[PDB]
Design a protein around this ligand. Structure first.
Ligand SMILES: NCCCCCCC(=O)O
Length: 330
């Protein structure tokens, strides 16, 4: 089997991407944030505290003939941005882009934190990291991908995120028309539950490539590119007037600037992030200070190749027995 679904930016800055997912019978379609940095499929639901729902589409398990309470199971998750959610669990039929999994754990939110409530465009998350990170207790549950894997033509999914445009998540096949050149594969460590890999270095603009190992995660659920302070300082030093602002919470730059590109290494290959991908616009409406798309990972504890980096590539998440990650230009 295979699946193919379009993923669409939630706003003009590509702050996140939503992908339609069919849950239950008859289908209830919710727009979920596919997140290769976590491993829970959770949704706004008929059980979510009413004051914490503001415009989201909800899953109502009582209206699904295939929903079954997973008795005794609860979940609770906290993300790196400080947001959180928790609730109980149903199993139901879940389909993505024509690919169907029966008996998928659908985590129904009873509570969500304010940033979820305030974002009316995201109806929940669909985790695509390794199932060892799944938060369901007392019986840990499998991700949609892990449940689908045996049925897939090939045990892979691909992320092809657009810059200010829709893109595609494919399951079970590699679309050889969706990238240019060849795909460079690189080793993955699953020790922390993430798609964790080591970049071979970086360049700033037309500068020389610095060969240096940068361990980090491929995380579709993180907007920005978070790298060591040394690397990020070298980037922003090439932008007149750029500075790190503790009041704003990271690097800002004059909105009048033209940003240089940023290149990262994948083995001997190179992925180039155009400067425009690094512009996240005014810090507040009408401001002439703009927020940078490359930020320091110091204090996070891990480097994160988020959407800013991933959208510059066609990315293969190879879930074979020995997992690997592939990157191609596009
Ligand atoms: N790996 C990313 C974890 C955080 C995702 C948060 C998405 C949201 O606010 O809808």
């Amino acid at each position: 089997s295979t699946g193919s679904a379009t993923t669409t930016p939630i706003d003009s800055l590509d702050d996140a991407y939503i992908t339609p997912v069919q849950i239950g019978t008859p289908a209830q379609t919710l727009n979920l944030d596919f997140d290769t940095g976590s491993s829970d499929l959770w949704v706004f639901s008929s059980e979510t505290t009413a004051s914490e729902v503001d415009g989201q589409t909800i899953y109502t398990p009582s209206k699904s003939t295939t929903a079954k309470l997973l008795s005794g199971a609860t979940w609770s998750i906290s993300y790196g941005d400080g947001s959180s959610s928790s609730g109980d669990v149903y199993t139901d039929t879940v389909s993505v882009g024509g690919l169907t999994v029966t008996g998928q754990a659908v985590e129904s939110a009873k509570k969500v934190s304010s940033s979820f409530t305030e974002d009316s465009t995201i109806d929940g998350l669909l985790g695509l990291a390794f199932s060892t990170l799944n938060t369901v207790s007392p019986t840990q549950q499998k991700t949609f991908f892990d449940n689908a894997k045996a049925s897939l033509d090939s045990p892979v999914f691909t992320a092809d995120l657009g810059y200010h445009a829709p893109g595609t998540y494919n399951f079970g096949f590699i679309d050889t028309t969706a990238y240019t050149g060849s795909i460079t594969y690189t080793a993955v460590s699953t020790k922390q539950g993430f798609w964790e890999w080591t970049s071979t270095g970086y360049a700033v603009g037309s500068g020389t490539f610095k060969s240096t190992s940068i361990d980090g995660i491929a995380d579709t659920g993180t907007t920005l590119l978070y790298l060591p302070a040394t690397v990020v300082s070298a980037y922003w030093a090439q932008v007149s007037g750029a500075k790190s602002s503790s009041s704003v919470g990271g690097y800002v730059f004059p909105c009048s600037a033209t940003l240089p590109s940023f290149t990262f290494g994948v083995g001997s290959a190179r992925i180039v992030i155009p400067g425009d991908y690094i512009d996240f616009g005014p810090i507040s409406t009408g401001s002439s200070s703009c927020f940078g798309g490359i930020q320091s990972s110091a204090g996070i504890g891990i480097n994160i190749f988020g959407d800013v980096a991933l959208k510059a590539a066609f990315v293969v998440f190879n879930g074979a027995t020995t997992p690997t990650l592939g990157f191609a230009s596009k």
